[PDB]
Design a protein around this motif. Structure first.
Motif, PDB file in Angstrom:
ATOM      1  N   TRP A  37      44.290  41.232  32.142  1.00  0.00           N
ATOM      2  CA  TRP A  37      45.737  41.123  32.214  1.00  0.00           C
ATOM      3  C   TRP A  37      46.275  42.388  32.855  1.00  0.00           C
ATOM      4  N   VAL A  38      47.107  42.229  33.879  1.00  0.00           N
ATOM      5  CA  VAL A  38      47.532  43.339  34.721  1.00  0.00           C
ATOM      6  C   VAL A  38      49.019  43.204  35.026  1.00  0.00           C
ATOM      7  N   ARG A  39      49.714  44.333  35.070  1.00  0.00           N
ATOM      8  CA  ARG A  39      51.043  44.404  35.663  1.00  0.00           C
ATOM      9  C   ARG A  39      50.998  45.314  36.886  1.00  0.00           C
ATOM     10  N   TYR A  40      51.760  44.961  37.919  1.00  0.00           N
ATOM     11  CA  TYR A  40      51.721  45.716  39.161  1.00  0.00           C
ATOM     12  C   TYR A  40      53.075  45.628  39.845  1.00  0.00           C
ATOM     13  N   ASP A  41      53.314  46.573  40.743  1.00  0.00           N
ATOM     14  CA  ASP A  41      54.545  46.641  41.516  1.00  0.00           C
ATOM     15  C   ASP A  41      54.269  46.179  42.937  1.00  0.00           C
ATOM     16  N   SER A  42      54.970  45.138  43.366  1.00  0.00           N
ATOM     17  CA  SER A  42      54.997  44.768  44.768  1.00  0.00           C
ATOM     18  C   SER A  42      56.201  45.438  45.422  1.00  0.00           C
TER      19      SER A  42
ATOM     20  N   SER B  46      59.001  44.181  46.232  1.00  0.00           N
ATOM     21  CA  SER B  46      60.271  43.698  45.705  1.00  0.00           C
ATOM     22  C   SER B  46      60.455  43.984  44.219  1.00  0.00           C
ATOM     23  N   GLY B  47      59.413  43.855  43.414  1.00  0.00           N
ATOM     24  CA  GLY B  47      59.571  44.013  41.989  1.00  0.00           C
ATOM     25  C   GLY B  47      58.271  44.191  41.248  1.00  0.00           C
ATOM     26  N   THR B  48      58.300  43.823  39.969  1.00  0.00           N
ATOM     27  CA  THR B  48      57.175  43.959  39.053  1.00  0.00           C
ATOM     28  C   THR B  48      56.758  42.590  38.537  1.00  0.00           C
ATOM     29  N   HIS B  49      55.456  42.401  38.370  1.00  0.00           N
ATOM     30  CA  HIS B  49      54.894  41.128  37.957  1.00  0.00           C
ATOM     31  C   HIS B  49      53.702  41.377  37.054  1.00  0.00           C
ATOM     32  N   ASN B  50      53.557  40.533  36.041  1.00  0.00           N
ATOM     33  CA  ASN B  50      52.385  40.528  35.183  1.00  0.00           C
ATOM     34  C   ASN B  50      51.521  39.351  35.579  1.00  0.00           C
ATOM     35  N   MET B  51      50.240  39.606  35.797  1.00  0.00           N
ATOM     36  CA  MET B  51      49.279  38.552  36.058  1.00  0.00           C
ATOM     37  C   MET B  51      48.078  38.656  35.141  1.00  0.00           C
ATOM     38  N   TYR B  52      47.419  37.517  34.964  1.00  0.00           N
ATOM     39  CA  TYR B  52      46.144  37.434  34.268  1.00  0.00           C
ATOM     40  C   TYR B  52      45.099  36.971  35.270  1.00  0.00           C
ATOM     41  N   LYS B  53      44.209  37.870  35.659  1.00  0.00           N
ATOM     42  CA  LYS B  53      43.087  37.529  36.512  1.00  0.00           C
ATOM     43  C   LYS B  53      41.817  37.504  35.678  1.00  0.00           C
ATOM     44  N   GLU B  54      40.726  37.094  36.305  1.00  0.00           N
ATOM     45  CA  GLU B  54      39.455  37.036  35.605  1.00  0.00           C
ATOM     46  C   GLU B  54      38.322  37.007  36.618  1.00  0.00           C
TER      47      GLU B  54
ATOM     48  N   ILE C 291      46.467  48.435  34.191  1.00  0.00           N
ATOM     49  CA  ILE C 291      45.517  47.531  33.559  1.00  0.00           C
ATOM     50  C   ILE C 291      45.949  47.385  32.108  1.00  0.00           C
ATOM     51  N   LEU C 292      46.547  46.241  31.784  1.00  0.00           N
ATOM     52  CA  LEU C 292      47.097  46.043  30.445  1.00  0.00           C
ATOM     53  C   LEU C 292      45.993  45.884  29.412  1.00  0.00           C
TER      54      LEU C 292
ATOM     55  N   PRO D  60      53.290  45.104  29.093  1.00  0.00           N
ATOM     56  CA  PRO D  60      53.681  44.226  30.197  1.00  0.00           C
ATOM     57  C   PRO D  60      55.130  44.446  30.607  1.00  0.00           C
ATOM     58  N   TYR D  61      55.439  44.027  31.830  1.00  0.00           N
ATOM     59  CA  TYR D  61      56.797  44.117  32.338  1.00  0.00           C
ATOM     60  C   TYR D  61      57.659  43.017  31.739  1.00  0.00           C
TER      61      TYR D  61
END
Lengths: 185, 222, 171, 51, 58, 159
Positions: free
Chosen positions: C77-82, C84-92, C122-123, F154-155
């Motif tokens: 689970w990750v948060r990152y800044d693009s 335009s803004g901020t987004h939380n994603m879950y990759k694997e 890295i959350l 998280p954001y």
RNA sequence: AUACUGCCAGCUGGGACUGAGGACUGCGACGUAAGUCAAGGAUGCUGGCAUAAUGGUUAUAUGCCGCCCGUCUUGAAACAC
RNA sequence: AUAUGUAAGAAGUCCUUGUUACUUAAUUGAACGUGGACAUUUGAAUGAAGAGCUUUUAGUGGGCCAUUUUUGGUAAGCAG
RNA sequence: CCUGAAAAUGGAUGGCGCUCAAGCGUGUUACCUAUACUCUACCGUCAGGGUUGAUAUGAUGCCCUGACGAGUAGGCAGGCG
């Protein structure tokens, strides 16, 4: 590259090797460089650099100045040493029996000293009698009393003798020099 | 004045006595060095045993090496680099770590790499590139007499006596450290390990505080 | 460099009124110890009223992978800044270690979203070896019973500039 | 006239450091240490291995 | 034709070439600018101390 | 045109204070200033006589002259490439004793006192001040203080 | 009992550039006693050639680089003089 | 925040005045003093490449460009 | 990535060309080369010093040590004609 903190290739700023071409002065220098290196006596060091000095930096010493010097307590029998000319003073009426070592004596100065029964020796004779400068008293003449220096630093509210040719009324005693004509300095 | 054996015998005997005490002192420093490193190790083991965490003392000595040239430096860090005796690129000096000197290091951070040198790199720095400031002149150490003739009043008699006063910051660190001419290092033998020097070490650059990784950088520069 | 999983335990400096502070700990993936302690103060500055000057780090340790030669499914689970803004994603991602999955994760984040290390938090890196906990079809396809595939069109590297027969891509 | 670097030129090394003989002879660059099994507490490994 | 009006650019650098040295301090500052009543009295007090000292070390 | 009077750009500098206008509390007239005392300059905007120029606000100097209501202050002012000696005739409302000066005098007496105690026994008192030193090694116990593990959050929007 | 880190005044190799400098000294090392040594800067041995062979000069070719000088100017190779 | 004044001592500190025509009700003080007690720590750090000082004189008195702050202007390789 | 996306001689990711790139984001190394850094030689400058020693060596002679070297306008110095 180096971040230099001081100016590079800077000369010392003091004299060595007097500007004079006089061989006898150069002879005295070579004697006193040798003494200033092999003796550890501080007297020889100051005599060596005093011999480099220019004429204005070696003001004359009158016998009056020496007589007052010999009136310092414990100083009556000391050898008076002056690097330069000893001049004669007619404002005194008594001279002690001292010994004076100097570069030069005026005719009256030498005659004054020998008549009182003392000696008028050169600095090469002093070295033989005092290689370490034993029992010496170095006499320096007045350096800030010459005519040129009273014009140094001339400016508003300094009191420093303007550079002027004719002196009198109507020669720079007006506007700028009194409040009845504008302002004062 | 026959002067064949009498005078030389006394001087060699005096030299021999100075060697014996230098030997005795160097053995003591090695014992003290080894004791301190083991005692740190033992303490970490004991804290782990008693469920606790051993926090090592903040490092008391830093070696700072100027990694930027002399052009285009603002006046305040330029003054600080001069007071730290880093007037050339790859010039290095030791700095006793205090709040007065730490604030100096944070001012010149974009222009230097520094960290905490170990005994090995200090020994190698002094042995390889060790010059004393004697009569305003940079004379190679190259002999125990040269340090004893200039730092003997503070009890520093050998090269190792000088190294000891640097690694374990002693009462006469300032005199011992200022006696050393600023170290003149080469460019690193294997490079800087990064494509661009003029970022912080943390950012994948080269400048700033690399805590223990100064040893690798300095040894490859020395 | 190679990401190493560091444990960083620090605390706020002990004052007179408050001896024995609360001793916060983090697991942060970093190249080395200097970046490890730096990344610690960056995050601990984000979750508490404390900075590097006002605190101390009491323990820095490396955490090793329990078994570096078993392949596992890692839920990231990750948060990152693009831009335009901020987004939380879950990759694997499949891997054998926590660290090499995180190395993989930063490579994928850079490739697919142009996210530089500066932009990524890295959350939580979580391991699972039980299926049906795996949500991404790009990972589920390697878990089918009796997996076997060719590697078609095998291109063989040449040491010399010239070769004296047309290549064969058979396998 | 010529600077000779210790860590090479063992002779200049022995001139500066008489202990270089003893350090070399006793192999203090590679010195063993005694062992005792002081085990860190179980809490310490739980914290390190904590998820 | 218009020119540049004013800038202090390069002025700090010029002032640091041989620059910002503090004014030299002396023992015994000039008693000008201090109160004349204090100055007049100070003159008498200094005179008596020199006479008083001379009597002691006769 | 341009305007450079004596008190130009003094709007907030010479402003009195918030809820501190009116008459000056009398302790400022009870303070004594001797020649050599280190004084600060903070102009009081209510008292218009003996006012320092705005350049001298925040400047610290030495008293050289003491008059009926004022003190002569020597202040070093940077003019070009050198400092010039300036002499201010300031009324007492616009000055106060420097606190750092008084603190150093206490250190002078404390240093002398510490030297007297140590000289009785010779324990190397070391009067000289020291910079803050790097921390010594310490052991942090974990009992009752188990480490609490933190992660980046998280954001979220919070709007 | 190991791809990691640190240290060794640990060991064994392979290449390159340099050889500055005294009619006589220093600091050291090595055997238990003729003294030697890699210790304040190269010597030993062996060849070929005493000549344009090396080298200097000059012409060309080749590789890479090289705008026209003086001036005024913030700025010139200037489509400025 | 940055920038900025001052201080971190030998011209400094601890005695019933030693002087005065100032000042005080007053030997009260103020200023300046004589004798007494204080070199490896001479009262933070780092550095210091020699300090300090004087005389005299050349050229210059068209500037321009980064980053950052910033004014006028839609803006400008614009003006400040 | 594509559309939006139109300017005048022919034309410029520097060019060729490049398509699991020789593109783009990122990681890890290896490698290349400045008049910069390290070391050494030689020139000069500056600084600090030594030297009244034998039936050879004017002491502005001889010698030791260290650092340094961009430069228009300009100043000074030592020289050349």
């Amino acid at each position: 590259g180096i971040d230099h903190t001081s100016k590079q290739h800077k000369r010392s700023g003091h004299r060595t090797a007097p500007k004079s071409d006089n061989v006898y002065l150069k002879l005295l220098v070579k004697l006193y460089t040798f003494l200033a290196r092999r003796t550890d006596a501080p007297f020889n060091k100051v005599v060596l650099k005093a011999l480099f000095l220019s004429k204005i930096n070696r003001p004359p010493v009158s016998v009056s100045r020496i007589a007052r010097a010999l009136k310092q307590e414990g100083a009556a029998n000391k050898t008076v040493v002056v690097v330069g000319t000893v001049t004669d003073d007619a404002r005194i009426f008594e001279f002690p029996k001292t010994t004076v070592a100097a570069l030069r004596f005026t005719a009256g100065a030498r005659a004054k000293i020998v008549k009182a029964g003392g000696e008028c020796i050169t600095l090469d004779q002093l070295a033989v009698r005092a290689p370490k400068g034993q029992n010496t008293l170095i006499l320096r003449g007045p350096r800030n009393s010459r005519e040129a220096v009273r014009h140094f630093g001339m400016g508003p509210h300094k009191g420093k003798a303007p550079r002027i040719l004719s002196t009198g009324r109507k020669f720079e005693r007006a506007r700028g020099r009194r409040r009845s004509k504008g302002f004062k300095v | 004045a026959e002067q064949v054996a009498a005078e030389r015998a006394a001087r060699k005997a005096a030299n021999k006595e100075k060697r014996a005490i230098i030997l005795e002192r160097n053995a003591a420093y090695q014992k003290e060095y080894e004791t301190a490193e083991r005692n740190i190790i033992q303490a970490k083991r004991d804290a782990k045993a008693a469920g606790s965490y051993y926090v090592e003392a903040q490092h008391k000595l830093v070696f700072v090496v100027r990694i930027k040239g002399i052009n285009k430096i603002p006046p305040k860090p330029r003054k600080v680099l001069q007071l730290l005796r880093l007037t050339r690129i790859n010039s290095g000096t030791f700095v006793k770590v205090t709040k007065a000197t730490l604030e100096l290091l944070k001012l010149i951070e974009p222009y230097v790499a520094y960290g905490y040198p170990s005994y090995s790199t200090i020994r190698q720095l002094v042995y390889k590139r060790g010059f004393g400031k004697i009569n305003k002149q940079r004379v190679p150490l190259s002999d125990n007499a040269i340090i004893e003739a200039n730092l003997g009043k503070y009890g520093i008699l050998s090269i190792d006596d000088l190294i000891h006063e640097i690694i374990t910051v002693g009462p006469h660190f300032k005199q011992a450290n200022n006696f050393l001419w600023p170290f003149k290092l080469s460019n690193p033998s294997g490079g800087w390990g990064v494509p661009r020097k003029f970022k912080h070490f943390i950012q994948g650059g080269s400048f700033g505080n690399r805590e223990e990784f100064i040893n690798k950088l300095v040894k490859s520069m020395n | 460099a190679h990401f190493k999983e560091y444990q960083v335990i620090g605390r706020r400096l002990p004052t007179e009124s408050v001896p024995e502070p609360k001793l916060f700990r983090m697991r942060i993936f970093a190249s080395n110890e200097v970046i490890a302690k730096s990344r610690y103060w960056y995050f601990l500055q984000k979750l508490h009223k404390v900075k590097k000057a006002s605190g101390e780090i009491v323990s820095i340790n490396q955490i090793n992978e329990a078994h570096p030669t078993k392949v596992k499914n890692f839920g990231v689970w990750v948060r990152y800044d693009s831009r335009s803004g901020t987004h939380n994603m879950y990759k694997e991602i499949r891997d054998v270690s926590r660290v090499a999955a995180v190395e993989t994760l930063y490579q994928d984040m850079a490739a697919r979203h142009r996210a530089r290390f500066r932009s990524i938090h890295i959350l939580k890196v979580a391991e699972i070896e039980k299926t049906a906990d795996v949500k991404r079809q790009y990972v589920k396809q390697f878990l089918t019973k009796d997996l076997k595939f060719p590697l078609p069109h095998r291109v063989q590297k040449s040491t010399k500039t010239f070769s004296y027969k047309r290549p064969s891509t058979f396998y | 006239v010529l600077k000779k670097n210790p860590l090479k030129n063992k002779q200049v090394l022995l001139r500066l450091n008489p202990y270089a003989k003893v350090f070399a002879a006793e192999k203090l660059g590679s010195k063993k240490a005694e062992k005792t099994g002081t085990k860190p507490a179980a809490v310490f490994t739980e914290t390190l291995k904590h998820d | 034709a218009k020119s540049k009006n004013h800038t202090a650019h390069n002025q700090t650098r010029k002032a640091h070439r041989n620059g910002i040295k503090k004014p030299k301090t002396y023992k015994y500052p000039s008693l000008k600018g201090v109160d004349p009543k204090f100055r007049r009295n100070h003159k008498h007090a200094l005179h008596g101390t020199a006479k008083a000292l001379a009597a002691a070390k006769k | 045109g341009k305007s450079h009077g004596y008190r130009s750009r003094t709007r907030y500098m010479f402003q009195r204070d918030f809820r501190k206008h009116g008459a000056v509390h009398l302790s400022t007239y009870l303070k004594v200033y001797k020649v050599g005392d280190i004084v600060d300059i903070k102009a009081n905007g209510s008292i218009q006589k003996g006012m320092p120029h705005k350049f001298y606000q925040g400047k610290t100097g030495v008293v050289y002259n003491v008059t009926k209501s004022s003190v002569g202050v020597i202040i070093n002012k940077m003019v070009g490439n050198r400092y010039l000696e300036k002499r201010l005739n300031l009324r007492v409302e616009h000055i106060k004793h420097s606190k750092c000066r008084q603190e150093f005098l206490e250190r002078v007496k404390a240093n002398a006192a510490k030297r007297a105690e140590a000289k009785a026994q010779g324990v190397a008192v070391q009067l000289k001040r020291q910079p803050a030193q790097p921390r010594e090694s310490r052991i942090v116990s974990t009992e009752g203080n188990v480490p609490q593990t933190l992660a980046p959050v998280p954001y979220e929007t919070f709007i």
